[PDB]
Symmetry: C4
């Protein structure tokens, strides 16, 4: 049954990312087109992580536990807050309305969950990040970013596999990350000029990603071999280009 579950997880993240697209540009503002944007993005990720880890190596018993709780709280503030209070909206008790909401959620997220809860929250966050970057510019810096990241993945995969043929948390993090990646082409192609059953080529990307994840879960059950991202990234790319022509 979860065999549909994780594709469900994708579909939902994409959907909520689109639903968030409208209220998100009521401010938004992260990063023109510019293909240098993916590079700035990558470097931002590497330095962010490098810092976060040096925070672990300098922490992180109650520190980075809390630190993460806080970052989580902020991003959840933006999710509930900016995206729902402006969608009401806007101001006053609604803003307050969402604070209570986000404090509730992070409190809920912290302590111990129950199966569906973590998945749900992850879906929310994921849709958030997806929406943000997808909005933060167009389907071509995004195309290059995707193919870059994916190619990195496949290479590190083959490499660390070939590095074998001799002789917990980060999983959920990385999971969310792949959940996020194609959604960026879906939002960022919704920010593009057709509009059948609400934006035809973004649909194309979306289905292409759903089949991508299908193929991935298949090879995943075939045994070991799966170059992580290049299925969903590149396949969502194929679906997008298929839905644009």
């Amino acid at each position: 049954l979860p065999l549909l579950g994780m594709p469900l997880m994708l579909l939902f993240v994409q959907i909520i990312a689109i639903v968030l697209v409208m209220p998100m540009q009521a401010a938004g503002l992260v990063a023109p087109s510019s293909v240098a944007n993916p590079l700035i993005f990558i470097g931002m990720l590497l330095a962010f992580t490098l810092v976060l880890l040096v925070l672990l190596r300098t922490g992180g018993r109650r520190f980075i536990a809390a630190f993460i709780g806080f970052a989580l709280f902020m991003t959840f503030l933006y999710i509930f807050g900016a995206l729902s209070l402006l969608a009401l909206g806007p101001t006053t008790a609604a803003a307050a309305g969402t604070l209570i909401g986000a404090v509730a959620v992070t409190a809920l997220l912290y302590l111990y969950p129950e199966w569906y809860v973590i998945d749900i929250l992850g879906v929310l966050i994921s849709a958030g990040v997806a929406s943000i970057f997808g909005i933060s510019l167009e389907p071509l810096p995004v195309l290059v970013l995707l193919v870059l990241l994916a190619v990195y993945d496949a290479i590190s995969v083959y490499r660390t596999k070939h590095m074998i043929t001799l002789a917990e948390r980060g999983a959920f993090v990385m999971g969310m990350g792949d959940l996020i990646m194609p959604s960026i082409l879906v939002v960022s192609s919704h920010v593009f000029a057709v509009l059948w059953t609400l934006s035809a080529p973004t649909l194309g990307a979306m289905v292409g990603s759903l089949v991508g994840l299908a193929v991935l879960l298949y090879f995943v059950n075939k045994g070991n071999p799966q170059a992580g991202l290049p299925p969903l990234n590149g396949g969502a790319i194929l679906g997008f280009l298929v839905g644009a022509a």
Copy 2:
């Protein structure tokens, strides 16, 4: 009866609040502070996280008395601001006032480092705590402070419930900083209310004492509880009671 024992902490509460008010006065005679935005609590919290990160990287990189040095200096400075504020409202801009506070803070900090009388420690803890309380209380207004309080309280209860459950799991299924610090927390709401003999914000002070009562009650019972929600929740209770008055 059970008076003299363990009343010293509600004593310390009242005292810190009082000295926080009395410090509300002189601290504006040279500004300080740091916009009644609800983002202010967030900036507060994050900056606090930076404060701890600094303190920890400082400790792990110690520093046998380098750590003692770094904190001794931090102390010296915060006492400079305390005393400074005192004389600068007192004798005002005069050289003998300022020099008075420098000599004062040198005296006090030196005393604390020279193995004092350690009833003294509680007293100084009260001074410092009242100081911080005054600063942030003078800084921006209730509703942000209210948010800050409720937030922090929630964090606390999460933390306690977590490590306690981690006790109930692991079978088969420096403290003064935290002390005087939580002594500070609701008092900051006590200040940021008289800043917006006293008002109807006595209410917050008594409610905070009653929170502390519930706290030292449960603490003097077997099988402990969370901390903040009695003190904050009770100070908030009293404060909101001090609204239904006027």
Copy 3:
């Protein structure tokens, strides 16, 4: 005779210099650089120290392939600048040129990470090295570069003499980075001279080759020596010889 063996390194020298010139050209068609101040070598050195500190804190915080990732990315980017500069002078501002270089750099970096042919490694090392050489050589003028060179050489000889003496004491009384890097150093002086078929700065190139000759001579002898002072001192020798010409 002893031709084909260990000529590949002077080969690599000449090649890197050549490709550094050929890169001198296109890199100004979009600027880059970074004032013929003698403080520039100092800024260079300090920034280099920051570069290493970053690389090390990155390694010790590794990062099994995170480190591989971080450097893979750095590589990818520097290759983007290389290729970029190429097509952007070639086909110019066109989309097919830029996309050409992105695809190019993806191809190259992917190749290098996929366990290539590792004669390939030397070739790419030559590309990169020529790149850096070109950048700083295009950046500011000789006398600062001269200072930089002599400085670095002095540091080197101190370091070698130190650890060698530490060998002679302790009884009873990734290398490619450093390699191609020192391959780079005098070449930067070769660029920053044609930037101020070639000039009388051929002289610096040959003198650098003769330095390398002395180097691979002593290295192929028992009981090693310092490194930089032959390459830099010899490139400088040839360069100053290329002044007594014109």
Copy 4:
């Protein structure tokens, strides 16, 4: 014989600090009077050190060895360079003249010395730092700074002594530091209005410091007890106030 040696070391550092005072304000510029200046100074030292150590804990085999070699080279650049080339002066081959000089010295300093050499170089550096801060403002922020630092020292000394009564490089660094401290009152009181045998009260401070060091070396040979700085700092202070009245 070194019984005079280390006082000699002091006298020399003070002298060269004064000799450097003139060419030093040909630019200079570190830190108005302002008694907040000592505090800024202290905090600067604590954060500087904290960083330097985190540089060790993140280094420091060839790194901080070199890093120090560099910092040393720069400060020696300023010493030879700014103080001698302007004292010639100024510009052209003189500036070059001192570069060769400083590269020589740090090169000389690195590798292995010979007794007198390290002392000499230390004296130079010390005079440099002394001159700089002494110039960088007046004898009253300096007075407070001195008495503060000294009182800290005596307290940490008593404390870590009382922490006993139960049951290499940094030495030279700290040595230089105490060599430095009173010289700051001598320079910074030379930047003050009398002028007998060239500034009478700064002489007063200088001798008061020489007797301070005398008393210190005496108690040092008495056995263990010496509250480090409060002899030379506070005693140079007494000498200054004696020479000013």
